[PDB]
Amino acid sequence: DIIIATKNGKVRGMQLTVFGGTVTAFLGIPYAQPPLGRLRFKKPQSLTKWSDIWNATKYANSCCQNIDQSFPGFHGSEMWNPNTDLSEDCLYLNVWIPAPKPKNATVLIWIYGGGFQTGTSSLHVYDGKFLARVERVIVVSMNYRVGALGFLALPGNPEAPGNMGLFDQQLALQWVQKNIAAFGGNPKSVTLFGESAGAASVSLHLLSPGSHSLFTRAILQSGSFNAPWAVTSLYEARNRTLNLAKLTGCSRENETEIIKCLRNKDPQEILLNEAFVVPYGTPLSVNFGPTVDGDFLTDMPDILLELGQFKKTQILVGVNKDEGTAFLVYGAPGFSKDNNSIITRKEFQEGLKIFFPGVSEFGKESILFHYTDWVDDQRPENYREALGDVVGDYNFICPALEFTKKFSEWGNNAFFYYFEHRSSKLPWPEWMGVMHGYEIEFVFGLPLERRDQYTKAEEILSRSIVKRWANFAKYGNPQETQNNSTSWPVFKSTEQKYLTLNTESTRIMTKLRAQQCRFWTSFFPKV
Amino acid sequence: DIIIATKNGKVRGMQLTVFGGTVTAFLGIPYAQPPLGRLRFKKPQSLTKWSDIWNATKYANSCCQNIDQSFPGFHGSEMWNPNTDLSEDCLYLNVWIPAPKPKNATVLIWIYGGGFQTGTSSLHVYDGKFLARVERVIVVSMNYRVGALGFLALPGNPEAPGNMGLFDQQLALQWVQKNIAAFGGNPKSVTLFGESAGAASVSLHLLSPGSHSLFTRAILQSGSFNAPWAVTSLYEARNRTLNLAKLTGCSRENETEIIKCLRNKDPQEILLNEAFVVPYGTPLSVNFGPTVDGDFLTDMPDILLELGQFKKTQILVGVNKDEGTAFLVYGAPGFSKDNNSIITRKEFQEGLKIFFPGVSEFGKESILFHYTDWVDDQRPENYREALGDVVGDYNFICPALEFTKKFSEWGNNAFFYYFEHRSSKLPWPEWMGVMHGYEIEFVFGLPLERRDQYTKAEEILSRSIVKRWANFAKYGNPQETQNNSTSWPVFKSTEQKYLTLNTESTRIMTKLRAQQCRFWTSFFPKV
Amino acid sequence: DIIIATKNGKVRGMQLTVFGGTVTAFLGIPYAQPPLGRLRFKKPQSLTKWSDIWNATKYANSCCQNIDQSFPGFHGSEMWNPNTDLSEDCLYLNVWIPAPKPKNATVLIWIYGGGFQTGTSSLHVYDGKFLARVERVIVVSMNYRVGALGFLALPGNPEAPGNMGLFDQQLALQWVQKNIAAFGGNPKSVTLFGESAGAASVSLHLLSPGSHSLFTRAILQSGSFNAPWAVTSLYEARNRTLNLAKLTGCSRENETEIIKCLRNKDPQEILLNEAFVVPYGTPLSVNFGPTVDGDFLTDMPDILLELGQFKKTQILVGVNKDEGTAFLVYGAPGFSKDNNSIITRKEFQEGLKIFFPGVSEFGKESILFHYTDWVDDQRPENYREALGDVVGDYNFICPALEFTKKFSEWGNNAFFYYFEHRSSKLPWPEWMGVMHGYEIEFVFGLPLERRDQYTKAEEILSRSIVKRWANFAKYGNPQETQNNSTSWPVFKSTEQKYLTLNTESTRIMTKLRAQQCRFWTSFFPKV
Numbered sequence A, B, C: 001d002i003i004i005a006t007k008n009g010k011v012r013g014m015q016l017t018v019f020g021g022t023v024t025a026f027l028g029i030p031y032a033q034p035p036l037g038r039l040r041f042k043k044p045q046s047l048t049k050w051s052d053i054w055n056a057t058k059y060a061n062s063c064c065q066n067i068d069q070s071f072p073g074f075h076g077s078e079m080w081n082p083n084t085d086l087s088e089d090c091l092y093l094n095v096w097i098p099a100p101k102p103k104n105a106t107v108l109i110w111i112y113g114g115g116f117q118t119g120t121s122s123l124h125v126y127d128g129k130f131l132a133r134v135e136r137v138i139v140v141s142m143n144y145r146v147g148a149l150g151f152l153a154l155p156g157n158p159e160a161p162g163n164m165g166l167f168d169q170q171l172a173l174q175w176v177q178k179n180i181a182a183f184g185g186n187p188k189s190v191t192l193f194g195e196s197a198g199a200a201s202v203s204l205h206l207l208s209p210g211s212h213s214l215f216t217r218a219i220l221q222s223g224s225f226n227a228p229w230a231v232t233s234l235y236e237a238r239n240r241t242l243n244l245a246k247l248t249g250c251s252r253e254n255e256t257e258i259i260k261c262l263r264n265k266d267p268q269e270i271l272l273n274e275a276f277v278v279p280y281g282t283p284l285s286v287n288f289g290p291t292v293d294g295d296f297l298t299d300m301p302d303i304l305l306e307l308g309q310f311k312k313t314q315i316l317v318g319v320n321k322d323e324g325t326a327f328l329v330y331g332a333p334g335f336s337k338d339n340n341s342i343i344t345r346k347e348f349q350e351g352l353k354i355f356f357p358g359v360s361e362f363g364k365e366s367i368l369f370h371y372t373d374w375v376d377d378q379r380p381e382n383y384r385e386a387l388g389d390v391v392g393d394y395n396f397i398c399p400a401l402e403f404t405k406k407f408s409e410w411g412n413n414a415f416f417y418y419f420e421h422r423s424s425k426l427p428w429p430e431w432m433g434v435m436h437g438y439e440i441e442f443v444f445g446l447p448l449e450r451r452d453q454y455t456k457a458e459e460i461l462s463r464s465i466v467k468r469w470a471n472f473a474k475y476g477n478p479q480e481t482q483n484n485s486t487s488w489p490v491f492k493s494t495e496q497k498y499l500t501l502n503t504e505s506t507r508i509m510t511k512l513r514a515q516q517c518r519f520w521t522s523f524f525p526k527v
């Protein structure tokens, strides 16, 4: 039996055998009042205190969210869909601890991605029991509200202030500050880590005054708040909040009434209308996301970044070789996960319309000009490869590289990885290559489970990443020091050295996508 | 009469005339509950508080330990054997203070060596009364548990967690923090010093979070935790703990039962079985030593060193010219302290088997290749000299130099000495040269006692070391500033300047054993 | 009426018109219990607290001391003799404050010289009322015990520990810490300043842990503790304490009895015997001075200096062009203040015997060799000029320059002056030039009093020094910023830039007495 006393009550966890050893798991600990009724659209309210033993023995409800129905029965897509009931009562977290109870363990806090519209901490690829077993860190993950329920904004007004779901993450970092010593954890050594929108989240907690003292270091996998999808403008957020009201017949004139009306709606009615709050979107649409709210976020975060207004600490930042591909089967003409997707120039062109909706014509010609100077015009997969690079360079790679540069210019050590390994078990076709989202199972150690059909070179690869991730968290330095590993150089403006992660040989390289990102970074923002 | 009040009671010391002056000595102060019965194999438990006057007027019991019986009647060996009764009730320490009571004296804390299997603070060569008299520092030394009683590990389990004897040292550093002002000492100026395993101990307290604030500076004589004998793996420690159980019929299945059974054994039964817990060992075997326990030591200490996770302070680190020789008479074919020990190539070869038991054949050829490229093949003492260099370079010299480099790369001043003087009174034969263990009597000032048959050049030599050791402790700088002495340069990576200590002329040199240690350090760890 | 409340009682001061303005003066405030009877030879004991108003309206008793009787009626000498009654009850201080009461004034604390055998704070040349009026700083000065009464040492024993008179200064710095806000002063901005032995005193408070937090900055005029006269060895101090006992029939065998006997002696008997505690001395003899006592001074102060163990702060350090001359009329053959003192080679030689008593013959030839390589052998005042340079270079100039170098090597700003102006009113003859002691009246502003027969160029010169001294104290930078003054560069090892102070033009120069001090500094200490 394993009972830990927390500030709000006792909690019982469960034992798990992992690799001939044991991890204790406390799945489903609540960390705020359920955000129902009067609390819907508001900042999470702190938790009341319960006598008796809360049983943390299974994953909790995931937050309400639309589901990916594009490929029913297909594991590639459905592995991302929620795997516990949806409910507004989803404000729970998970703790995994080494056995025996560590004395003062480093803490890794996972923040999932999903475009801020979806996702859940209980996915199999986010299971932190391998990290606990293997590295003897503590792993914490949390559910936070996504979609309108988590990010609806009517700026300035506490009935729907914006950013609630970032406040959910925050209040969870707080629970770790107050509660994690009880579990053997060191609150003074906490590293946040997250992928995609979860990484953008990590980057904004680097910017948020309220989060500054709730963690030590940050890891950002395929995401940063300067990505084009990551922050909704005040303009767009209002449009969207009013468009939502309109669609649920909740148009009022007293904004406080719009909200009271929206709180009478039922979760499905709200969910059902999210996709149409925008005239057009893309497979990468973030209808309801982070906004400048004057609370969590005090100013446009591009301004905060440029002017050095963020927590000073080491960062680890990374991306995957084919970020963009996964999106092309969600609406680009001629693409399919069921064939090789050789598209035409005219298809490439119609695809830019898919991903770059408004979108001066000259903007889009400029993307075509930059990405279609073939070397040479012979290769039939030319336009298929260009569309994916366009999508992942614009959306992930250049914004992560620009974040890393700017961040590092203020004096902190920063390490950048280029993930190039395609999973031996990937269900998506070969042409989609090293996809967005598919480093996560390496980071979490799923390939250390031999029962599991990954190659030997994949176990070794993941053991190494685990070790680098954990050394980063405990010591601010992502080195694997024991096995004659390539040394991971800090990333500096000027050199921009990054490390490549793959099964064959890892390399030190410089200036990832220098030519592409000059385009996205200097020129495109102008169109 | 001299009574000092301590946090746990009053203690009476004794006066001593040293060099027409007086030192007060408090020999035998207890610093923890005796670790008997239920407490055997556990972390030292703090001391209860006694009214009345504890009389600190003689050395206490030494901890239980096997004794060196190889050379009965021989002073060279027997000078290291314990000289007070053995008992498990050995958790005592010694304080020597200048007379008159100093006002705020610097404190030198001695930690003896002995492979972690033996040794005691009451040896004549560890008598700190000369340091007190001559330099007006306070000298503290402590007994701590050695062998299985002090280092038996069944990882994670507080009935035998590992590292108890390092916890004994720690709790002693604590007693100095709480108690040494009473004696005229400055708790804010404490330097740890120790030889061989005692030096490895000093280097791990540099790594232990719990020791960080219990001292100021460190001196490491012929030892550091990166030496090959200094840390037992988790693998090996379990094997050994189970092998011990097995040999005492204490095999159980409930590890807590293995321990309860071992606590019924009597000290001799335990001692008697230690040597055989390993299929083979060497004269340098450390059967039960420090382990990564997640308490004292939080991670492999090579990783902590590499990644800069240690207390930031000055270090003084040293070795002797012939570290290896002393070991060759304990099992290498053709060696003897009673003749000149000219061995053959085939003897050298059988000796590598002695010292490098498992031990790829190619590993050992590689040592032979590196160490037998004669210049030239004429000299009959060629192979005798090579075996000792092999042993001392592998075991002491290169690991001390690598520790010093790595430590210094994080910004702290570090000073390295090469001790080259052979004692005029050495009982071991000439060929064993400047032996391991034989700087200690110079450090402790025994040659300042003229009654004593050391040469004049030896008094001068020791007066100088005493002065450098004491300046290091008080001021972080091991200079002898008054007598036109060679200035001792800091040790930097890049230059690796070290100072030679001998009667004739001391020198500044660079890169001690550069070629040898490239071998031990880059190549050998691979075999 | 002007009453200020202090921690021990109220004190009444007196108003003074200075330069059409007003300064309040509190002359004679006690700062410790009188050190009579049982207290003779002991550390000053803190003051009891008095109700009623202590009247601070005249200077107090000077401490017991031998008087200079060499030139009765002669103002040059007698200006240094005490000008208030001698008594053991002399532990008093003086405060001068600007009117109106300043708000948070910088404090200058004066410590007089006199070889540690003589002197008093109430001399006319130490009158701080001009500084208060002109610069609106507060001036504090204190009497402290000199001779055996202030520095008798029987090392380790609190009945006569040594350094009492340095403890008197200290307890006075303490009174300023506790009391000076009451007077409008800032305890957090205190600069110690002093001349000759008073400067050596300032330099040892830079070395004393107990003084570290009782002041901010230091000024040292013609003196530093590394001067050859400034610290008595333990050897010599004992000899001298026993020689004193012997001469007063107080030889005992119980050192505590020697002291009790000495405390029965009457001040004159003690004073009368001081000069003979040494087989021979010189005009520069310091029979009873500072010793290493393990309390005020924890180690030889040369060692503390070399190894950087002193308060880190700015220093201002200076000397006069003819330091040595004043001493030559006190015992060197052929010298007289009443003629031009052209001495012969053989006289020069007998003079070295005067100043360098024991004193290898080769030591003295070496001084002659260094100082008599004439350029050229024609000039009749050659040997007269050489003897004075010998005396002032050995005793003052090189030790002040070496202090300044060593001090500055630890990172602090340091400024060095060369004082070259001879007072228009000097009573000593011309050949004695710019004498020791004769910058003081410029520092204290006596030439700002026009009533007073100094030239115009002297008023201007002193106004400037006052301004530089005061800017140093308030701002750590001795600049005169308003009147196109030469800028005073910091003194660095390497450049050794110093500023010359004279009526004509002040200069920046480098490496004062480079050739002379190489001699005193590297070579002579060897003989």
Ligand SMILES: *[C@@H]1O[C@H](CO[C@H]2O[C@@H](C)[C@@H](O)[C@@H](O)[C@@H]2O)[C@@H](O[C@@H]2O[C@H](CO)[C@@H](O)[C@H](O)[C@H]2NC(C)=O)[C@H](O)[C@H]1NC(C)=O
Residues within 6 Å of the ligand: A239, A243, A244, A246, A247, A276, A277, A278, A279, A280
């Ligand atoms: C800000 O919002 C308006 C609202 O338009 C929307 O009505 C919503 C409830 C929803 O159904 C949505 O799909 C619909 O478009 C946007 O105005 C629309 O913009 C497009 C192109 O400009 C027009 O074709 C529509 O006719 C027009 N609708 C109305 C009623 O005015 C507006 O575009 C939007 N801003 C953006 C581009 O985000």
Ligand SMILES: *[C@@H]1O[C@H](CO[C@H]2O[C@@H](C)[C@@H](O)[C@@H](O)[C@@H]2O)[C@@H](O[C@@H]2O[C@H](CO)[C@@H](O)[C@H](O)[C@H]2NC(C)=O)[C@H](O)[C@H]1NC(C)=O
Residues within 6 Å of the ligand: A332, A333, A334, A335, A336, A338, A339, A340, A341, A342
């Ligand atoms: C690769 O497949 C795409 C996707 O479209 C198809 O999916 C196939 C696997 C198959 O079931 C097909 O019937 C289904 O429609 C093909 O793109 C499609 O091209 C067809 C040919 O006319 C058009 O009718 C569709 O508009 C277009 N689909 C869309 C909406 O994008 C593609 O042609 C095929 N190409 C290959 C084999 O390279």
Ligand SMILES: *[C@@H]1O[C@H](CO[C@H]2O[C@@H](C)[C@@H](O)[C@@H](O)[C@@H]2O)[C@@H](O[C@@H]2O[C@H](CO)[C@@H](O)[C@H](O)[C@H]2NC(C)=O)[C@H](O)[C@H]1NC(C)=O
Residues within 6 Å of the ligand: B239, B243, B244, B246, B247, B276, B277, B278, B279, B280
């Ligand atoms: C881990 O321990 C086993 C235990 O073997 C030992 O049994 C002990 C109680 C003790 O007496 C010891 O001397 C003895 O060897 C080791 O297994 C042994 O290894 C050697 C060489 O591999 C074999 O020749 C033995 O037959 C074998 N014994 C058994 C019973 O299996 C094992 O080697 C050890 N690991 C190491 C190398 O440290």
Ligand SMILES: *[C@@H]1O[C@H](CO[C@H]2O[C@@H](C)[C@@H](O)[C@@H](O)[C@@H]2O)[C@@H](O[C@@H]2O[C@H](CO)[C@@H](O)[C@H](O)[C@H]2NC(C)=O)[C@H](O)[C@H]1NC(C)=O
Residues within 6 Å of the ligand: B332, B333, B334, B335, B336, B338, B339, B340, B341, B342
């Ligand atoms: C130096 O002595 C060694 C040690 O062995 C011997 O000790 C001697 C002092 C003597 O008492 C001798 O009888 C004792 O055995 C000698 O090595 C030994 O060589 C002998 C010769 O056959 C062998 O029998 C032994 O196996 C071997 N001893 C071991 C176990 O190492 C050595 O030969 C001698 N050599 C010299 C003089 O250089």
Ligand SMILES: *[C@@H]1O[C@H](CO[C@H]2O[C@@H](C)[C@@H](O)[C@@H](O)[C@@H]2O)[C@@H](O[C@@H]2O[C@H](CO)[C@@H](O)[C@H](O)[C@H]2NC(C)=O)[C@H](O)[C@H]1NC(C)=O
Residues within 6 Å of the ligand: C239, C243, C244, C246, C247, C276, C277, C278, C279, C280
């Ligand atoms: C340490 O002190 C002794 C004491 O000698 C002195 O006796 C004193 C009371 C006083 O009167 C003093 O003038 C007198 O000299 C010194 O011993 C003396 O040293 C000189 C030269 O060495 C001799 O000529 C004296 O005869 C001798 N006196 C005795 C009785 O031994 C000693 O020199 C001194 N150390 C120094 C040099 O400071």
Ligand SMILES: *[C@@H]1O[C@H](CO[C@H]2O[C@@H](C)[C@@H](O)[C@@H](O)[C@@H]2O)[C@@H](O[C@@H]2O[C@H](CO)[C@@H](O)[C@H](O)[C@H]2NC(C)=O)[C@H](O)[C@H]1NC(C)=O
Residues within 6 Å of the ligand: C332, C333, C334, C335, C336, C338, C339, C340, C341, C342
């Ligand atoms: C400068 O005067 C010195 C000091 O000696 C004398 O002081 C004079 C002013 C005068 O009163 C004189 O009588 C008095 O003795 C002279 O040195 C002296 O030289 C004389 C000449 O024989 C010697 O007798 C003395 O030993 C010596 N005095 C001492 C003890 O130092 C000096 O000669 C005179 N020289 C000049 C004018 O340059």
Ligand SMILES: *[C@@H]1O[C@H](CO[C@H]2O[C@@H](C)[C@@H](O)[C@@H](O)[C@@H]2O)[C@@H](O)[C@H](O)[C@H]1NC(C)=O
Residues within 6 Å of the ligand: A103, A104, A186, A188, A189, A190, A216, A473, A474, A475, B209
């Ligand atoms: C646990 O260690 C605490 C501090 O450890 C951290 O220091 C931080 C500044 C940060 O660098 C982390 O990465 C370090 O690991 C210490 O103060 C606590 O007292 C310790 N608590 C225990 C052992 O109970």
Ligand SMILES: *[C@@H]1O[C@H](CO[C@H]2O[C@@H](C)[C@@H](O)[C@@H](O)[C@@H]2O)[C@@H](O)[C@H](O)[C@H]1NC(C)=O
Residues within 6 Å of the ligand: B103, B104, B186, B188, B189, B190, B216, B473, B474, B475, C209
């Ligand atoms: C004794 O001195 C104390 C501090 O001295 C030390 O400062 C440390 C930081 C370290 O550098 C040591 O090497 C120094 O010697 C001081 O704070 C205490 O108050 C003093 N205690 C006394 C005199 O009772």
Ligand SMILES: *[C@@H]1O[C@H](CO[C@H]2O[C@@H](C)[C@@H](O)[C@@H](O)[C@@H]2O)[C@@H](O)[C@H](O)[C@H]1NC(C)=O
Residues within 6 Å of the ligand: C103, C104, C186, C188, C189, C190, C216, C473, C474, C475
């Ligand atoms: C008086 O000023 C105080 C501090 O002034 C000094 O700061 C010191 C660090 C030192 O640099 C000095 O040279 C500065 O002048 C301030 O804290 C006090 O509160 C002030 N007191 C008053 C006005 O009553």
Ligand SMILES: *[C@@H]1O[C@H](CO)[C@@H](O)[C@H](O)[C@H]1NC(C)=O
Residues within 6 Å of the ligand: A055
């Ligand atoms: C918690 O789980 C344990 C299972 O042993 C049990 O005490 C109880 O059923 C649980 N409490 C509940 C269901 O609230």
Ligand SMILES: *[C@@H]1O[C@H](CO)[C@@H](O)[C@H](O)[C@H]1NC(C)=O
Residues within 6 Å of the ligand: A254, A256, A257
């Ligand atoms: C709008 O009416 C609502 C009813 O609750 C209230 O929240 C708010 O005060 C009103 N705002 C104004 C002043 O129109």
Ligand SMILES: *[C@@H]1O[C@H](CO)[C@@H](O)[C@H](O)[C@H]1NC(C)=O
Residues within 6 Å of the ligand: A460, A463, A464, A467, A480, A482, A483
């Ligand atoms: C280090 O090496 C060993 C053996 O070569 C291997 O089993 C392990 O996976 C490696 N550890 C890390 C941290 O990669």
Ligand SMILES: *[C@@H]1O[C@H](CO)[C@@H](O)[C@H](O)[C@H]1NC(C)=O
Residues within 6 Å of the ligand: B055
């Ligand atoms: C401590 O030693 C002294 C010796 O004078 C004495 O009081 C007593 O015998 C001792 N106390 C003991 C033996 O416990």
Ligand SMILES: *[C@@H]1O[C@H](CO)[C@@H](O)[C@H](O)[C@H]1NC(C)=O
Residues within 6 Å of the ligand: B254, B256, B257
């Ligand atoms: C093993 O039995 C012992 C008896 O004390 C006890 O320490 C421990 O709880 C048991 N472990 C288990 C659960 O098997």
Ligand SMILES: *[C@@H]1O[C@H](CO)[C@@H](O)[C@H](O)[C@H]1NC(C)=O
Residues within 6 Å of the ligand: B460, B463, B464, B467, B480, B482, B483
């Ligand atoms: C310094 O020198 C003296 C005399 O030459 C000598 O007696 C002493 O041993 C030396 N001191 C040190 C610290 O070596």
Ligand SMILES: *[C@@H]1O[C@H](CO)[C@@H](O)[C@H](O)[C@H]1NC(C)=O
Residues within 6 Å of the ligand: C055
């Ligand atoms: C202090 O001086 C004043 C002068 O006005 C007066 O009150 C009194 O005589 C003095 N107190 C004394 C002499 O103790």
